[PDB]
Design an enzyme around this catalytic site. Sequence first.
Site, short mmCIF file in Angstrom:
data_model
loop_
_atom_site.label_atom_id
_atom_site.label_comp_id
_atom_site.label_asym_id
_atom_site.label_seq_id
_atom_site.Cartn_x
_atom_site.Cartn_y
_atom_site.Cartn_z
N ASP A 109 0.84 -1.20 0.00
CA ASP A 109 0.00 0.00 0.00
C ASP A 109 0.88 1.26 0.00
OD1 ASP A 109 -2.95 1.03 0.56
OD2 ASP A 109 -1.67 2.14 1.97
N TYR B 197 2.89 9.98 0.19
CA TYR B 197 3.87 9.38 1.08
C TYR B 197 5.30 9.73 0.69
CZ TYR B 197 -0.11 6.39 2.51
OH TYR B 197 -1.34 5.96 2.96
N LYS C 21 -2.70 6.09 -4.57
CA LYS C 21 -3.83 6.90 -4.18
C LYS C 21 -3.67 8.28 -4.78
CE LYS C 21 -4.14 4.56 0.34
NZ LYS C 21 -2.83 4.13 0.88
N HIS D 264 -7.84 9.13 -2.15
CA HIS D 264 -7.21 9.08 -0.82
C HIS D 264 -8.15 9.55 0.29
CE1 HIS D 264 -2.89 8.88 0.90
NE2 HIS D 264 -3.75 8.69 1.89
N1 LIG Z 1 -5.80 5.92 3.33
C1 LIG Z 1 -5.39 6.68 4.50
O1 LIG Z 1 -5.85 7.75 4.77
C2 LIG Z 1 -4.35 6.07 5.42
C3 LIG Z 1 -4.18 6.60 6.66
C4 LIG Z 1 -3.26 6.06 7.49
C5 LIG Z 1 -2.51 4.98 7.07
N2 LIG Z 1 -2.66 4.45 5.82
C6 LIG Z 1 -1.87 3.34 5.30
O2 LIG Z 1 -1.98 1.97 6.13
C7 LIG Z 1 -0.94 1.92 6.93
C8 LIG Z 1 -1.62 2.11 8.28
O3 LIG Z 1 -0.78 1.85 9.33
P1 LIG Z 1 -0.21 3.14 10.18
O4 LIG Z 1 0.84 3.87 9.40
O5 LIG Z 1 -1.34 4.01 10.69
O6 LIG Z 1 0.55 2.35 11.39
P2 LIG Z 1 0.04 0.90 11.99
O7 LIG Z 1 -0.13 -0.22 11.00
O8 LIG Z 1 -1.24 1.11 12.77
O9 LIG Z 1 1.34 0.54 12.98
C9 LIG Z 1 1.60 1.40 14.05
C10 LIG Z 1 2.95 0.98 14.68
O10 LIG Z 1 2.86 -0.27 15.07
C11 LIG Z 1 4.35 -0.87 14.95
N3 LIG Z 1 4.28 -2.27 14.63
C12 LIG Z 1 4.15 -2.94 13.49
N4 LIG Z 1 4.16 -4.25 13.76
C13 LIG Z 1 4.32 -4.39 15.07
C14 LIG Z 1 4.41 -5.52 15.85
N5 LIG Z 1 4.35 -6.89 15.37
N6 LIG Z 1 4.56 -5.41 17.16
C15 LIG Z 1 4.63 -4.17 17.73
N7 LIG Z 1 4.54 -3.06 16.96
C16 LIG Z 1 4.39 -3.17 15.62
C17 LIG Z 1 4.96 -0.20 14.00
O11 LIG Z 1 6.23 0.33 14.56
P3 LIG Z 1 7.63 -0.07 13.80
O12 LIG Z 1 7.66 0.45 12.38
O13 LIG Z 1 8.77 0.51 14.59
O14 LIG Z 1 7.75 -1.57 13.79
C18 LIG Z 1 4.03 0.96 13.59
O15 LIG Z 1 4.70 2.14 13.61
C19 LIG Z 1 -0.03 3.13 6.60
O16 LIG Z 1 1.32 2.89 6.56
C20 LIG Z 1 -0.58 3.59 5.24
O17 LIG Z 1 0.06 2.71 4.22
C21 LIG Z 1 -3.58 5.00 4.99
O1 LIG Z 2 -0.83 7.10 5.83
C1 LIG Z 2 -1.57 8.08 5.48
O2 LIG Z 2 -2.39 7.98 4.52
C2 LIG Z 2 -1.51 9.45 6.19
C3 LIG Z 2 -2.94 9.97 6.41
C4 LIG Z 2 -3.53 9.80 7.65
C5 LIG Z 2 -4.81 10.27 7.90
C6 LIG Z 2 -5.51 10.90 6.89
C7 LIG Z 2 -6.92 11.41 7.22
C8 LIG Z 2 -7.15 11.89 8.51
C9 LIG Z 2 -8.40 12.38 8.86
CL1 LIG Z 2 -8.73 13.00 10.49
C10 LIG Z 2 -9.41 12.39 7.94
C11 LIG Z 2 -9.19 11.92 6.66
CL2 LIG Z 2 -10.55 11.97 5.51
C12 LIG Z 2 -7.95 11.42 6.29
C13 LIG Z 2 -4.92 11.09 5.64
F1 LIG Z 2 -5.57 11.72 4.60
C14 LIG Z 2 -3.63 10.62 5.40
C15 LIG Z 2 -0.30 9.56 7.14
C16 LIG Z 2 -0.23 10.18 5.74
#
Ligand SMILES: NC(=O)c1ccc[n+]([C@@H]2O[C@H](COP(=O)([O-])OP(=O)(O)OC[C@H]3O[C@@H](n4cnc5c(N)ncnc54)[C@H](OP(=O)(O)O)[C@@H]3O)[C@@H](O)[C@H]2O)c1
Ligand SMILES: O=C(O)C1(c2ccc(-c3cc(Cl)cc(Cl)c3)c(F)c2)CC1
Length: 316
Positions: free
Chosen positions: A46, A51, A80, A113
Amino acid sequence: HQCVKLNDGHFMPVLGFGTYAPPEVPRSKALEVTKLAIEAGFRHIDSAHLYNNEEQVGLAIRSKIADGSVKREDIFYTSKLWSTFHRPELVRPALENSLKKAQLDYVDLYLIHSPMSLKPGEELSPTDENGKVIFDIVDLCTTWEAMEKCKDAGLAKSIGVSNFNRRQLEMILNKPGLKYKPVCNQVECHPYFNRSKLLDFCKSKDIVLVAYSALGSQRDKRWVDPNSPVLLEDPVLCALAKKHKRTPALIALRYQLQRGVVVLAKSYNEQRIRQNVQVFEFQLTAEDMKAIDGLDRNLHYFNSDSFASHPNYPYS
Ligand SMILES: NC(=O)c1ccc[n+]([C@@H]2O[C@H](COP(=O)([O-])OP(=O)(O)OC[C@H]3O[C@@H](n4cnc5c(N)ncnc54)[C@H](OP(=O)(O)O)[C@@H]3O)[C@@H](O)[C@H]2O)c1
Ligand SMILES: O=C(O)C1(c2ccc(-c3cc(Cl)cc(Cl)c3)c(F)c2)CC1
């Protein structure tokens, strides 16, 4: 090693690698760890234009392809469209620019996104003279139409959305002349915010819910309240982990899989990356699942303070 069939006939692996690291993490790390995740068994990656890592992520895939570890058709790769590119004429160029940075012929999946359109231009986060992020008004049905052109041209094998609520999904769904439903909706989903109502809605429409911050998010100080609870120190997840002698993280991931949610997991740590693939080695009891169901506290880890006023802010 399981996949879920999407409503356009394509398949998506139920476990995905999240690639976002904050900007202080050097860009060469994204290249390293994407390689480690593929070696460990990840096939669903992803990323996003926001990013600032797609070149590194693309270089990782090209390297694992060139060493014979995988073929391009084994990798499920996601990007995205960022919110400054919602105006329909900017969508294909934004996708094409991502394809050039990553050096790929197509994406396996392309997402909107966020539904909070932003002022078009080059800045990712355009801001006025008083520090406010600058909104823009865009009919997302026209954005979606341009998305559908992108699938037709074969540059995106599947198209979906992210951060939509029910009202925004129905808007796409009830669109006159709609050609392709969204295959998925990528939303914040974890035991403290389990989105059961949205999940039930997406299930009735054959739309996959994809979870991010499934491990409680990175707790980035720009967005996350320091006083918010730490997902992985939760006494019920910790108790469950000892019973199965897994880890809390692994309980949180397995929870999403058994309720039919596709789950993302970010880690830039070799050992934790390899640990997360073990989510396929055990199962939680139906009663464990009910116990986890009872943790929901409607907690969004991401604090929107210049976004709460957006007309399309989804937690309204
Ligand atoms: N579409 C959107 O708006 C949106 C928003 C947020 C995120 N995302 C995407 O989905 C992913 C979401 O995850 P996130 O970035 O929010 O973080 P996350 O998956 O919720 O992980 C949070 C923390 O947990 C740690 N972790 C991972 N595996 C672990 C394990 N086995 N044990 C203990 N800790 C562990 C990691 O630290 P370490 O790296 O130090 O291991 C990571 O920093 C993102 O990277 C992004 O690709 C998309
Ligand atoms: O990993 C990601 O996609 C990030 C991210 C995290 C959160 C959002 C987001 C947060 C709120 Cl409060 C609302 C919406 Cl619609 C997106 C966003 F657009 C993007 C950290 C850059």
